[PDB]
């Protein structure tokens, strides 16, 4: 079941996201950027970010510090540690690639809802389950990202054997009951932002 869906809001989000290959190449370009970090840097960033996302206020100040190159704006020691690691600090030199990467990832995280941030904290404790969320969402996006339509469809039964916290997807506008979902292009930016965040996080965990 599909119906053409043209509003200004669906058009905007279709201009941003209409081609899975392009989206996936953009994500790969951020992941190869991660491959420039040492494992201790990746570890420090990943673990500190999981604490920062417990408080939207501190996460916003981290984003402002990154975007304005102004370490004075952070309001917590976990964000401060991130800035110290990438050189945005006294006696540091801010590393251009790392700043760009962190702006991208932190901006994506500020778009999550409180419930999504709480779920992310839960699912990161099991890498198989975390990756399963990534894989299921990737499949839905690959199937629907080119469509300027509201689509009702089902997941392959093979994608339903490991557990999911489907509220993670519902908070981005992907309605789900059982194995059936409704893809609405008015929520495409939220869904693709969520996928970009969890795809990238899976590579730093």
Author numbering: 13 to 217
Recite the paper's sentences.
Viruses acquire host genes via horizontal gene transfer and can express them to manipulate host biology during infections. Some viral and host homologs retain sequence identity, but evolutionary divergence can obscure host origins. We used structural modeling to compare vaccinia virus proteins with metazoan proteomes. We identified vaccinia A47L as a homolog of gasdermins, the executioners of pyroptosis.
An X-ray crystal structure of A47 confirmed this homology and cell-based assays revealed that A47 inhibits pyroptosis. Our findings demonstrate the potential of structural homology screens to reveal genes that viruses capture from hosts and repurpose to benefit viral fitness.
